């Protein structure tokens, strides 16, 4: 056990030594990719069963 | 004290108290008050487009083509069938060595097909071969475990899950494990390539995921959060940020840059565990599979359920969305595959 | 008066009470495919509906034509008493059919997922389906029973279409169950023996419970009105009318009671309980 | 079109049916029990490797053997949560890792995923289990001394010219399984003990029954009767 100790330890210290950003920010990105193709989702707004291979 | 071993282990938690505190640094806010002003999606009714039969037993995988067309389907009576979803016709018939089959990936140049179970063989069929019948091409030996989950970077390089609690990079013509990433303790049962195959991540039974860098080789992100196994996740179409779903009845939303959960997708009336996991195209709408023969649309920036997906006749087990974003593919333990728009 | 209206309602709570529990399992089938998807699912199906047909048809007639006392649709009630014969006797015939079901499922397990095919279930629905409209509408159409509406039919036709109806089901539905019986108590027996070596009559009195529920509720309900039925236009000691009628509707109150002792399984309770909630 | 439909639905009818009936049994079990010696035994006797399928009196079965090699074989065993039984081997002479198999078999009987699967014990090697009875070199009682005290069912049914010793010590293992079966109870599931050699040829007879057996105690419990 003591192998998986010292790598225990050394994978949590380069994990720990990450810089994180607010999740505000985080947020404000997954709405800016959301509503930057909002209107381009089928399965959220249907389109038209003109255009869908499987309804015409 | 003095053994260095409970200094590592005191060292350890002291760790895990720093990450908690480098967390709740950038845990200034929380996503239900970032989304309280935007508007739910309304009412979305998918309806059951096409239904794929020929398989006799339970399907387990299914992956859609690039063209948003094709798709391969895995059953447990030991075949790969090959479907044109607009058509409802079967291209291809593969049967396979091993019915136990678990996963099964497609090459994004519609060339080559996967799978593989409890072989711990991944076995990979070029489609685009000039004579007669598609039959193996090369074959990937060398886990101790049964291979979950498998996905093509190219023609020539798939990274594949397996129950020896590691998961590695491929030269599949070589055969060699050209990278090896180990560190977690229980079965690593999905992976998910980034958008871009730089990252992937994998979640495993130690109630874990990682995040894992392709060409280092090393972890660099442990998210925990889940009391029990993680079963299923998958990334963000924007690429820094994923979902997983476990067996504790609960889904949950990790992001990469922020190291920390940013959201949990529960309900007190769902029970039962979580096998698939998929984003819609802009990845506002997070799908995801139940054992009660249902699906469950949650409105992946809000948490609030948007819609159910009640049209199979057994568990489903598999899901997945086209990369176009034009349908959705439900396989179940009914032995039939639906198309959902 | 008190007792004529009394009468009427408790027998519009009889019949509603029919309509609800049979027309609940037949959307409880049609709109869970997953029940429908077993095969001995549509012999329950084939009793609630005929069930169904016994109360739209054939009871709120007869309880007005008791109330008012006399038959105001008038040239119609000959119809009525042929759907009177036919639908309290696919009733019957469906019951034994279930029990045998059960019995192929017990007696040889392995034969049964082999032979019992949606085929061979639709042949056994059609054979009572066709044995009831047979038997019941051909004499009447054809006025072979006869010698306010009379219902007395005739000594031949009573005693033909009685054992035909009930004797040969009830024959068999006694034998089937008595046969489950001893299955039963070999295997509880034999794990007694494997628990009682372990560690070193309860699970006996469930089964005992359960078929005698099953059986007796039965017998007990139609029985008798068919031991009347068949001495009655013999002996034309002696009965009235009233007490006739009584015993019909004992024989129409199984038809009230099929859904609850048939159609109770946790799945179909969960499926009751998700529709009305 | 329709004459293509019609031969496409009624051979899918009858596959689907088919698959629908062949009868999966898991067979799990420590290793050096002779487990792949008896799926080899059956590959060859009826019809070793990890799969094998036999048909017995047109009865279809499908065995088969994990060679995952781990302790919680959750995903590698809740993705076979269908099989008809388990056929659970024990390797009776190896005198100490019988309490390993004991722990793995309490653990199998009360799992989460296996709640509703019943099990078929096979003691397998009881003629090296005799040989080292008759040695009378290493016994029982030195792992557990509960053997000591233990006595002869008056049930048993021993086999023309079987030593009281070899009956005491088979049907000890026996109990010390059924100890285990008969705690959880419950009635979903039960354990079916045999003593098995690698040898014996009525192996599949043995699986029929049990199979047959299983079928009739679930169609009981569904409709309540037992
Ligand atoms: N004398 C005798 N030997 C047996 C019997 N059954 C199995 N063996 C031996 O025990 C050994 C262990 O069996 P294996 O073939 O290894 O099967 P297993 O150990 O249960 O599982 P694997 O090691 O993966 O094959 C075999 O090599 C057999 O030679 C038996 O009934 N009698
Ligand atoms: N409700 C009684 C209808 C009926 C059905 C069958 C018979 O044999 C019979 O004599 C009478």
């Not at chain 3, 609630?48 to 016994?54: E, H, M, Q």
């Not at chain 4, 079916?192 to 049990?210: G, K, L, Q, S």
Request: a positive charge.
């Amino acid at each position: 056990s003591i192998a998986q100790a010292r790598k225990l330890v050394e994978q949590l210290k380069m994990e720990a030594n990450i810089d994180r950003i607010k999740v505000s920010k985080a947020a404000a990105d997954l709405m800016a990719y959301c509503e930057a193709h909002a209107k381009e989702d089928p399965l959220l707004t249907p389109v038209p069963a003109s255009e869908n291979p499987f309804r015409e | 004290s003095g053994s260095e071993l409970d200094q590592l282990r005191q060292e350890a938690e002291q760790l895990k108290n720093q990450i908690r505190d480098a967390r709740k640094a950038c845990a200034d806010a929380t996503l239900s008050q970032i989304t309280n002003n935007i508007d739910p999606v309304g009412r979305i009714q998918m309806r059951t487009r096409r239904t794929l039969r020929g398989h006799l037993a339970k399907i387990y995988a299914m992956h859609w083509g690039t063209d948003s067309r094709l798709l391969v389907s895995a059953s447990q009576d030991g075949k790969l069938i090959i479907w044109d979803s607009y058509t409802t016709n079967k291209v291809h018939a593969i049967p396979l060595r091993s019915s136990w089959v678990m996963t099964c990936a497609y090459a994004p140049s519609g060339n080559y097909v996967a799978c593989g179970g409890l072989d711990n063989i991944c076995s990979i069929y070029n489609l685009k071969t000039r004579e007669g019948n598609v039959r193996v091409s090369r074959e990937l030996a060398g886990h101790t475990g049964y291979l979950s989950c498998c996905r093509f970077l190219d023609d020539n390089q798939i990274v594949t899950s397996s129950g020896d609690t590691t998961c590695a990079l491929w030269d599949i013509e070589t055969g060699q494990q050209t990278t090896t990433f180990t560190g977690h303790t229980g079965d690593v049962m999905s992976l998910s390539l980034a958008p871009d195959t730089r990252l992937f991540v994998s979640g495993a039974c130690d109630a874990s995921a990682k995040l894992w860098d392709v060409r280092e080789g090393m972890c660099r992100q442990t998210f925990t959060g889940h009391e029990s196994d993680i079963n299923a996740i998958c990334f963000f179409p924007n690429g820094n940020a994923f979902a997983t779903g476990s067996d504790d009845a609960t889904c949950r939303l990790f992001d990469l840059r922020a190291d920390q959960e940013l959201m949990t997708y529960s309900h007190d009336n769902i029970i039962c565990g979580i096998t698939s996991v998929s984003f819609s195209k802009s990845g506002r709408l997070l799908l995801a599979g139940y054992d009660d023969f249902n699906c469950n649309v949650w409105d992946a920036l809000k948490a609030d359920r948007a819609g159910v997906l009640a049209g199979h006749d057994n568990r489903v087990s598999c899901l997945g969305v086209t990369d176009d974003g034009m349908a959705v593919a439900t396989g179940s333990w009914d032995s039939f595959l639906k198309i959902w728009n | 008066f008190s007792v004529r209206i009394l009468t009427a309602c408790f027998l519009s709570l009889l019949i509603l009470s029919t309509l609800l529990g049979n027309t609940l399992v037949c959307a409880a089938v049609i709109r869970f495919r997953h029940l429908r998807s077993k095969v001995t699912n549509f012999f329950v199906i084939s009793l609630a509906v005929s069930d169904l047909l016994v109360a739209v048809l054939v009871m709120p007639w007869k309880a007005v034509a008791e109330i008012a006392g006399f038959w105001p649709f008038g040239s119609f009630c000959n119809i009525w008493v042929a759907f009177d014969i036919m639908c309290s006797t696919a009733s019957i015939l469906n019951l034994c059919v279930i029990s045998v079901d059960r019995y192929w499922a017990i007696s040889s397990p392995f034969r049964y997922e082999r032979k019992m095919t949606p085929k061979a279930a639709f042949i056994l629905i059609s054979v009572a389906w066709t044995l009831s409209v047979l038997i019941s509408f051909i004499p009447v159409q054809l006025s072979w029973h006869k010698a306010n509406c009379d219902s007395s039919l005739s000594r031949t036709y009573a005693i033909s279409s009685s054992v035909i109806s009930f004797y040969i089901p009830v024959a068999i539905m006694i034998v089937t169950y008595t046969r489950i019986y001893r299955i039963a108590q070999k295997q509880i027996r034999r794990i007694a023996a494997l628990e009682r070596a372990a560690v070193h009559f309860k699970r006996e009195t469930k089964v005992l419970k359960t078929l005698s529920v099953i059986m007796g509720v039965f017998v007990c309900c139609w029985l008798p009105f068919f031991i009347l039925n068949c001495i009655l236009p013999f002996c034309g000691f002696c009965i009235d009318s009233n007490t006739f009628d009584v015993f019909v509707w004992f024989g129409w109150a199984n038809s009230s009671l099929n859904p609850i002792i048939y159609a109770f399984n946790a799945d179909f309770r969960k499926a009751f309980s998700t529709l009305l909630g | 079109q329709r004459e293509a439909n019609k031969k496409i639905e009624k051979q899918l009818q009858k596959d689907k049916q088919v698959y629908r009936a062949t009868h999966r049994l898991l067979l799990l079990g420590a290793d050096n029990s002779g487990k792949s010696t008896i799926v080899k035994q059956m590959r060859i006797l009826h019809g070793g490797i990890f799969e094998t399928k036999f048909q017995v009196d047109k009865v279809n079965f499908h065995m088969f053997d994990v060679g995952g090699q781990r302790d919680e074989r959750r995903k590698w065993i809740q993705c076979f949560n269908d099989v008809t039984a388990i056929i659970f081997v024990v390797d009776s002479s190896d005198y100490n890792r019988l309490q390993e198999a004991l722990n793995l078999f309490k653990s199998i009987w009360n799992n989460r995923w296996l709640r509703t699967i019943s099990v078929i014990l096979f003691l397998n090697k009881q003629d090296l289990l005799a040989e080292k009875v008759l040695a009378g070199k290493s016994k029982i009682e030195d792992y557990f001394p509960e053997f000591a005290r233990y006595t002869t069912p008056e049930d048993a049914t021993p086999e023309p010219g079987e030593d009281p010793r070899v009956t005491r010590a088979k049907y000890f293992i026996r109990d010390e399984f059924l100890r285990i079966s008969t705690a959880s109870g419950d009635g979903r599931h039960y354990c079916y003990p045999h003593f098995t050699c690698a040898v014996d040829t009525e192996n599949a007879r043995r699986i029929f029954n049990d199979c047959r057996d299983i079928i009739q105690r679930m169609h009981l419990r569904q409709y309540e009767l037992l």
